[PDB]
Amino acid sequence: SPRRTPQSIPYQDLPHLVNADGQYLFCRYWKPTGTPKALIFVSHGAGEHSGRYEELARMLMGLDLLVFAHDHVGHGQSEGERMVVSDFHVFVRDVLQHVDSMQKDYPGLPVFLLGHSMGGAIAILTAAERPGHFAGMVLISPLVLANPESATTFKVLAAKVLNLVLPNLSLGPIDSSVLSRNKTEVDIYNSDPLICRAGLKVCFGIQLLNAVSRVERALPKLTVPFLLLQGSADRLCDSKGAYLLMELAKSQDKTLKIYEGAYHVLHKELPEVTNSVFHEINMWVSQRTAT
């Protein structure tokens, strides 16, 4: 039978790619009318999917960038057990595969990364693996810092051989109102069928702890230009993490913007925060796409 998405749509009906593990990833393209000036890959957060970047992608497409994305393994319309991954590097490897494919099709163009939350950790590590290769990075509340998770909690490492015992063991779900002050966007989040709202599995939590530890080891060599957007009342990724990234990255071109009282999902926050987010990304990329 034809390979299908978890929602039963055949991959032959959708844009897709097949990763090095033989898993189908659903892909999304926003391509401008004229020759693109640049490429930008958008990397979504844990639990969500690429269709949540439609508006952001339209704004970038308006700048004459060719925007592209995929749902990470275990997410959205892509294959894999939900919110599970053998090693965090699989996300990075798959992004590099997609970026390399797009660059074959569009040689000579500069390539940018845009990442949110766990997607931001993926962009950091993607850029770190290929120094000098990306023209720049836009980060929205990137996952950079472990959430004050004690040494006892981390000993859940013990439960990972428990997640071999009980694999689905979960840390348990987050309150969705921690996501955004904007209630409409909270309700949209709660009602999107492609979003996984299940609590974070222990084995995935361990991969996220690997990400955060790898991001810390990578910052010494990260030199890519970046823009970092962060809310002061973010409960999922602490703002402290954003200042650490500014201080420890070696990038010569780094900019931080703090949104006072804002929660995690800045591109879906209260309209005055969200408008400023779009405009700041617009200018930053635009100035580095004249370069």
Place this chain on the structure above:
Amino acid sequence: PRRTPQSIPYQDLPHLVNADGQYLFCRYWKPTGTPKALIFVSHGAGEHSGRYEELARMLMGLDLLVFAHDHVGHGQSEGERMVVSDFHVFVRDVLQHVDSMQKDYPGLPVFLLGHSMGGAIAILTAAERPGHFAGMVLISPLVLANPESATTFKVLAAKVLNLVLPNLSLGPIDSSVLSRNKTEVDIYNSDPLICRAGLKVCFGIQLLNAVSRVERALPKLTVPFLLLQGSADRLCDSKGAYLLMELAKSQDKTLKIYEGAYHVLHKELPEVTNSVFHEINMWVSQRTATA
């Protein structure tokens, strides 16, 4: 009226008379046309308004009416060199000059730009008139005391000392920490209007007063600001910039860190300095269209 030590009458030069009856030397950079906005430039300790010439010319090229004076005890203004009865004198005098300029250009937005001690003065100025200023640009602002510097023991010892030797020099700084651009250090070292003698104990106590008022003003500070800071600054430690980003309540705050750069960012290596002028250009310019 009186004569400067260079023999010259104070009324001969553009000036203003402060509440204590002292003459401050003033500098104006006016655009031919009608200006889009006012910006006051406040200089740092030991230096003077003449060092902001290139910056002021750039701002004037954006159609801003740039103005400044030399703080009392500095440059071509009156007063004993680097002494002040109370730090708030600096802020009063900035306010005086701003209110005058506003009377002549009613309805124009006013900006503040400050460096080092000049940055603390701008912060205190904005805090004293919340909602009044359109924006503040701070370069390596003084916001934190030296590590040893502010214990109750050290403060008592500095006050005891002030009673008998108020002008005892705490020792000059090594001007090589100012900038990695050796030419700019050499220029700094040979400007006769720069006071490079060590800090006097009486003025040391007033800068501690300034830091302590800054920490209390932060919670009330709501003005839009761009903050520019070098990561290897030995005079104003970058940790002070992160704290400002964190504790200020402004809704519109941006931080840029220059990796490896020293204190005087607008007179640093050229790659840094050109970026500094550009960033100030964009930021003021976006908030001047707004007028």
